[PDB]
Write a protein that binds this ligand. Sequence first.
Ligand SMILES: OCC[C@@H](O)c1cccc(OCC2CCCCC2)c1
Ligand SMILES: OCC[C@@H](O)c1cccc(OCC2CCCCC2)c1
Ligand SMILES: OCC[C@H](O)c1cccc(OCC2CCCCC2)c1
Ligand SMILES: OCC[C@H](O)c1cccc(OCC2CCCCC2)c1
Ligand SMILES: [Fe+2]
Ligand SMILES: [Fe+2]
Ligand code: NA
Ligand code: NA
Lengths: 510, 510
Amino acid sequence: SSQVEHPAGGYKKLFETVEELSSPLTAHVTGRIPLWLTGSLLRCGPGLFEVGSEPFYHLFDGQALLHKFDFKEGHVTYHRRFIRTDAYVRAMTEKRIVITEFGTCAFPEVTDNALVNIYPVGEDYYACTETNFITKVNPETLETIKQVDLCNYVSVNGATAHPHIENDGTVYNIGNCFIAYNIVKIPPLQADKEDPISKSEIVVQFPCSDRFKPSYVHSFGLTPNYIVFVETPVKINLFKFLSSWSLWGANYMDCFESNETMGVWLHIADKKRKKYINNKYRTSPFNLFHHINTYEDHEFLIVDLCCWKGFEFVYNYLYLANLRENWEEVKKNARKAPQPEVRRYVLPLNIDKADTGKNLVTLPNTTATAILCSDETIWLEPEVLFSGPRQAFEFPQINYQKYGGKPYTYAYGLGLNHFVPDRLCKLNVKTKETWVWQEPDSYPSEPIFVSHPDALEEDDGVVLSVVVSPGAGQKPAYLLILNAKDLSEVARAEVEINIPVTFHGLFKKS
Amino acid sequence: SSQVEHPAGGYKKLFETVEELSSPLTAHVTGRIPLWLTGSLLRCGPGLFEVGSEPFYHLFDGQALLHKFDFKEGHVTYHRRFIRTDAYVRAMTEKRIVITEFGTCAFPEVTDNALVNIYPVGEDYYACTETNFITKVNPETLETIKQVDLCNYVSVNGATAHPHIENDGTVYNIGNCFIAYNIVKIPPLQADKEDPISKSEIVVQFPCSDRFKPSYVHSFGLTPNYIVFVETPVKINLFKFLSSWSLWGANYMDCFESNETMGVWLHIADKKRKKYINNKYRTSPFNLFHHINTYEDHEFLIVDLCCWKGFEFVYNYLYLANLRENWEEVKKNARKAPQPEVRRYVLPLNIDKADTGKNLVTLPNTTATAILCSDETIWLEPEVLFSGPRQAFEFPQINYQKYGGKPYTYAYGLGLNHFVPDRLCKLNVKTKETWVWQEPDSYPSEPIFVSHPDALEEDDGVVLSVVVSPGAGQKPAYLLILNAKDLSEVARAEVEINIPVTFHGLFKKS
Ligand SMILES: OCC[C@@H](O)c1cccc(OCC2CCCCC2)c1
Ligand SMILES: OCC[C@@H](O)c1cccc(OCC2CCCCC2)c1
Ligand SMILES: OCC[C@H](O)c1cccc(OCC2CCCCC2)c1
Ligand SMILES: OCC[C@H](O)c1cccc(OCC2CCCCC2)c1
Ligand SMILES: [Fe+2]
Ligand SMILES: [Fe+2]
Ligand code: NA
Ligand code: NA
């Protein structure tokens, strides 16, 4: 949890327009950047929160800005460029908001504003949002290369900003299909050097709980053998979604609604045999954005999640007008929101009918349960790993390359305090111990883990976070490096310009 | 949680018949019995687990034994006597099992085997089980005085072993009525000196979810202004209950069943105005035996519970044949049981329809939620205070006389390890910090709190527990005194005879 209030309102700098750079800046280092740290921290966020006098309204509307911190021989540079999406290019051409964004209707066509994340496919990098459009970008120069429409390759209406990436480069993702949720597989780059996106295919399909209302999906779980999909009560109303938006004046937010009675349905598919498994896992209602990690343990799936307790859409609390209020009002506004909580669910793969009415979770190290009912629903209860009052452990990251899909011990996260990011956190998922890093008037980003290249342990490395520090008598922002063992500071690299909120990203080793 | 295994099987001594004493024994003190500790620890449990060659089968069937430890000027005595109930007297007369017990059908009439608890009414003390019969006992000599049939005074079929006792001596209890659940109030002793039981009355009534199947009820919550009743999915099948038992060969356990779909319904009544409040609080399924404490906070009720996650009746795992198995088998048998977990529920008293779809728990220091649905059900999620794998914090006690019904910080409990009692625990309900006391091959009882006479703080006092220590090179049992601050040992008082399991009790100051 946080130990800090924010009466000075500095968090408003997260949502203020910035200018791009024409070339990199030096970042001024205090302490010692590790000499084994070589590569680029690439991150995406909104950078332009209005077009002239026309405002963007929602957190997820501002124009995509691609950021890069470079690390070589103890030195750091910072660079950023707006992504030349259709949304951005047409906005600059016509000097107004042209494309409708998540929560901003454009007055007189799907957004490709790739403000959320960036990931590798073959030898390429793509910036993304959650639509059918992804944007190929140059990871060295930050130039925009092209727009890719996933509909030219596979049958989905969109795909999440959180694909899984296996160690050979295979990319898995999930998307709505308008009715199913489809898993897309993009193969690794082959000898022919053809674009792996042209070899995309749907490998498995998950059913939908309601023919006319698919659930919003933000991420999904993956292990060597299984795919996990969590179907929440946050629904997309297709009657509103598919009607003419410029007639009714609609955006994406306007089409969301909450199903009050379904709770959460959890789904598993066999990855290698490409089959849906018809086990009816059921639990109480929550919003889910981020899976933390998923793994197999004696034929139970361990499903660690960042939950929000409630069925109201958490995104209702993320309009910029609310995030820009003063601190007492920010706290007030969050009082009735769903409460964040880290939860471990445990899904049995072997269901014996003879155990009807009993708890199937016979593993020795968990309090999670799964009750087989007579109608064959399997009712689940979680093991809570972390819970604090409006204190969210969010934007989770792990040592992904060596523990993604596997038994693991450690997660890193951004701590939110009534939605305001104000600390960095580490959680031991076995013991429930936590570690916190926090300074007054300092607004960090998602922490990304970088292993020492020769590490044998799980947390032998560092985390990197971009911190906005608007207090006078500090530079406006800095790159923070913490030791992953205990979250103690190793170095920081200060820049002379503001940096807005960033969502997700990656470290690219060179 | 426990840090101890039990391969030697010493816990079997908890379920072995003992003899009563004709007068008190000296208990041999090591350490220092506090000099302010003056009075009697009175506890009940089973003491006779067979009649000749006819065995009792369930944990709750053995014949009531009343135990007393007396404390004066640093010295301790121990005494025990079988309660001369009908069940026990008729068993000794006819040399067989005569009355059907909870899980033992007598072959060729309600049990009054008062093996569970003891409590004060006026100037009297009554041993009890959960039926219509309570047994008046002499707290100094342990002689049995009288059988009292509550049906002579009030309309209930039974009453729990956990009445609440206000500081003036007013007694509240709850019981099934064959359909409602009735709250009984027994007034304090008046100037006329008449038996307060003859002034008993029903003051409020809770409705039942199912006309033909009332829930099992073990305890309930009380505050200065409210009464809280938790209606669980463990049901009593009245078609089986009210049929002829000697025809079918039935006991009480045979009439229980689990309702799979209802979950848990929570209920509130206004204590002083004597009215049921029609708020439909709803959550997922659990067993509940013991409320920890309940209190009011800005017109939310804070409801702290010892839960078991699941709908299967936890009492299925408590047959003596299973509790007497070897340790690996004990662990195996508990794998599919509901998982224990301490949970805080928060119940809003002011429900605004304008907040439909939102979380009503606007208190600043909890993660518990209550979602108002369109059908006006209020769906609850808990804040988990403690959770360990088959590690139950059970038999909760607090500083009851000063903090019962009131804002509080500390609870004490008996720790169960796959149902075997092997440690004592303290929980800070605000911070979730825990303290444990535990020795190898030592089986404690419920801890009971006794305040220091000059206490300033909530935990200024001791806890008393009866510990069974069957390892050779130790005496068979002892009275343990722990400092309530940190659960460090202050003294023990050893006795030269075995003591079986005890359930509940009280400290009587003199
Ligand atoms: O994928 C982007 C993250 C978004 O899903 C999400 C999920 C859960 C909480 C949340 O909070 C938004 C805050 C982030 C930091 C800036 C202030 C608002 C945002
Ligand atoms: O009111 C009497 C206690 C009974 O309700 C109960 C409630 C919850 C767990 C439990 O476990 C039984 C073990 C207690 C210690 C002896 C061994 C069995 C027993
Ligand atoms: O996670 C934050 C919102 C996301 O960036 C976003 C921004 C703009 C449009 C979106 O649309 C989601 C739909 C796309 C089509 C298929 C159904 C989901 C989603
Ligand atoms: O907590 C252990 C079981 C309890 O002592 C017990 C022992 C014997 C008979 C019982 O009967 C419960 C019913 C009484 C009549 C009304 C419905 C409950 C209950
Ligand atoms: Fe995300
Ligand atoms: Fe009890
Ligand atoms: Na600090
Ligand atoms: Na110990």
